[PDB]
Amino acid sequence: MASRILLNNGAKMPILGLGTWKSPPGQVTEAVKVAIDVGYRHIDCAHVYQNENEVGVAIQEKLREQVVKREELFIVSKLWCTYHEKGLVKGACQKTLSDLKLDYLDLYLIHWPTGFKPGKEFFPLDESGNVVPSDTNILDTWAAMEELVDEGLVKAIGISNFNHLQVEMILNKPGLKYKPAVNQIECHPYLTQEKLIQYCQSKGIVVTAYSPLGSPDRPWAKPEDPSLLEDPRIKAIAAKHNKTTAQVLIRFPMQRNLVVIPKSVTPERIAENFKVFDFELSSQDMTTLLSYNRNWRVCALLSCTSHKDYPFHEEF
Ligand SMILES: NC(=O)C1=CN([C@@H]2O[C@H](COP(=O)(O)OP(=O)(O)OC[C@H]3O[C@@H](n4cnc5c(N)ncnc54)[C@H](OP(=O)(O)O)[C@@H]3O)[C@@H](O)[C@H]2O)C=CC1
Numbered sequence: 001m002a003s004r005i006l007l008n009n010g011a012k013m014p015i016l017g018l019g020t021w022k023s024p025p026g027q028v029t030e031a032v033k034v035a036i037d038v039g040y041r042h043i044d045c046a047h048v049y050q051n052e053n054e055v056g057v058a059i060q061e062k063l064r065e066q067v068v069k070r071e072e073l074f075i076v077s078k079l080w081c082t083y084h085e086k087g088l089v090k091g092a093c094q095k096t097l098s099d100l101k102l103d104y105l106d107l108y109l110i111h112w113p114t115g116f117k118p119g120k121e122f123f124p125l126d127e128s129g130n131v132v133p134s135d136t137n138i139l140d141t142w143a144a145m146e147e148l149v150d151e152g153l154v155k156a157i158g159i160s161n162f163n164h165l166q167v168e169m170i171l172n173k174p175g176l177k178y179k180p181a182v183n184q185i186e187c188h189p190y191l192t193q194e195k196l197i198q199y200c201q202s203k204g205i206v207v208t209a210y211s212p213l214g215s216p217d218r219p220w221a222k223p224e225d226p227s228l229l230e231d232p233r234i235k236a237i238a239a240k241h242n243k244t245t246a247q248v249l250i251r252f253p254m255q256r257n258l259v260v261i262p263k264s265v266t267p268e269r270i271a272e273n274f275k276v277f278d279f280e281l282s283s284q285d286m287t288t289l290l291s292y293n294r295n296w297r298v299c300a301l302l303s304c305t306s307h308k309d310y311p312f313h314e315e316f
């Protein structure tokens with residue numbers, strides 16, 4: 001297994017990256033520096049995570065130390081929902097570039113298909129708790145994303161949390177210039193996504209699996225919720241291979257030809273999570289892990305379910 005997957009712009013994307021959602025600003029600089037030292041080359045960022053400046057400090061130090069060159073890193077960020085209007089997309093990208101202290105991004109994603117009212121709040125709500133939409137549609141935001149490629153700010157563009165009809169809408173866009181390179185979606189043994197992943201891969205779109213460990217630090221976790229890291233069936237597969245449960249959960253998507261982006265701020269775990277290139281799950285193990293699907297989705301907010309472009313009413 002090769003460590004990088006070819007995208008439809010001819011660039012190679014590392015199949016393992018470091019996630020940064022919920023990584024506190026006081027701890028994420030060290031986390032990214034340790035990750036680069038132990039071999040990570042792909043970092044997944046977003047403006048809404050409120051820590052891009054601190055991620056940028058780490059990247060800049062390791063470029064200055066000559067640990068890595070810029071061309072070896074693969075830096076991803078995402079356009080938040082309050083910037084879907086075509087005249088706001090460039091300025092949102094440039095704020096992220098300014099915080100990360102970079103002159104281009106390797107990949108820039110539409111974070112969610114839903115546009116929200118522009119303003120200071122990331123989740124503008126009405127008096128009854130519903131998100132306030134904007135009158136934007138995904139095709140005009142896509143055309144604004146394409147302009148960032150032509151201006152040299154980003155090397156590739158893609159999408160996140162799009163269902164297959166929303167992907168189809170972009171693929172059928174009048175005058176489509178650049179196809180989405182990536183769809184970043186939730187994927188783990190309790191939400192295996194078979195139909196959407198085969199949809200995407202058949203279309204030449206690479207899939208990145210987010211929350212591969214089930215996001216145990218998500219703020220809305222409840223004590224009664226399932227835990228992938230503690231599932232005794234997954235523990236038994238790990239023990240057979242003399243690996244940890246997290247290492248099996250990271251290797252699983254890699255063998256489906258997915259990119260995977262586990263988050264940690266703990267140095268030991270950052271190093272553990274990288275040590276996944278020296279074993280293989282058997283075909284039988286893969287089919288068994290797929291059988292654990294329960295259509296259990298952890299990233300989906302009730303306040304967004306009446307939005308016209310909410311992605312998760314459709315089957316896939
Ligand atoms: N596009 C989108 O809408 C979304 C994108 N994402 C991206 O995907 C990334 C990963 O998903 P995320 O939801 O953060 O959750 P993960 O599934 O990656 O789980 C992160 C949690 O697992 C813990 N952990 C990490 N490694 C280990 C290990 N070896 N052993 C035990 N526990 C471990 C972490 O603890 P600790 O940090 O304390 O070590 C943290 O509590 C995000 O950070 C973000 O970059 C996620 C959700 C949505």
Ligand SMILES: O=C(O)Cn1cc(Cc2nc3c(F)c(F)cc(F)c3s2)c2ccccc21
Pocket residue numbers: 021046048081111112114299300301304305307310311
């Ligand atoms: O987004 C991240 O990366 C991490 N991340 C994930 C969620 C849950 C969402 N669920 C939805 C949703 F169903 C929508 F339709 C639109 C939307 F914008 C959200 S956001 C979230 C909520 C607050 C901050 C980060 C969050």
